[PDB]
């Protein structure tokens, strides 16, 4: 159960954009089998030269997930920000388990 | 009147402590008292709170309160 919070500046947070952000970051639940309910901080901003930025923070208890991206349009950045986040969950989880198993 | 299956119902004399209003009507409760009235009615002197001689609907209670006038109070309070 994830609770979102989008800080739309220099842009309008339309419902289609809200649905796109919610459904793409919602697939992270498969990895981290108990995601304690936490608040997601999402920021969007667009420049004058048609560049889009997304910043995500998901403060899981021992897992501080972040990723920030800059690309052409808004949708490419959101699709490319999952890869940076999924790496950190896979990095943090498999670091704990295999090391205590020498 | 079947015997042995009824609670005791000895007579009793009522007294109203509010205004000293004597009254006679037998009651089941013994109340552990003794007093004789009206040429001999020796029984418990059961005390009680206000009877029908002082209640609002059961007696002639006049006001026990006051009223309001509002606009009168506004005229009185303001001057």
């Amino acid at each position: 159960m994830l609770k979102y919070n989008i800080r739309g500046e220099n842009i309008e947070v339309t419902e289609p954009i809200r649905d796109y952000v919610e459904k793409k970051i919602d697939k992270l639940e498969r990895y981290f089998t108990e995601t304690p309910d936490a608040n997601v901080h999402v920021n969007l901003k667009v420049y004058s030269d048609k560049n889009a930025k997304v910043e995500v923070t998901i403060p899981l208890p021992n897992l501080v997930l972040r990723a920030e991206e800059t690309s052409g349009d808004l949708y490419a950045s959101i699709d490319l920000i999952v890869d940076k986040l999924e790496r950190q969950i896979r990095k943090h989880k498999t670091k704990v388990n295999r090391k205590f198993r020498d | 009147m079947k015997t042995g299956i009824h609670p005791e119902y000895r007579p009793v004399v009522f007294v109203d402590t509010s205004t000293d209003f004597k009254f006679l009507s037998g009651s089941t409760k013994s109340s552990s008292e003794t007093i004789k009235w009206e040429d001999g009615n020796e029984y418990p002197l059961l005390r009680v709170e206000i009877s029908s001689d002082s209640h609002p609907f059961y007696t002639g209670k006049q006001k026990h309160a006051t009223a309001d006038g509002r606009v009168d109070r506004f005229n009185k309070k303001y001057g």
Binding site: - | R70, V71, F74, N75, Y78
Partner: protein, 81 residues
Amino acid sequence: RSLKKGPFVDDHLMKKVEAAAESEKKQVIKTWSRRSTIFPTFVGQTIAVYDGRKHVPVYVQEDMVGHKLGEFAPTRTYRGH
């Protein structure tokens, strides 16, 4: 005025209804002063009170004496969620 020196009544509102006693609820009164306590002289009259963007009419009763005009002219428009 919530003190002994009161009550507080707006001049131009008080004078207008005072000369409207001949009308006897024959003219609507269009006023802005919401900070005037309702007087006994106001009873039976209908006044239009500015609620921030328009005038809303209220018929003065006896129960309304001692209150302010604005109490019967809600400002915020709430209709649930």
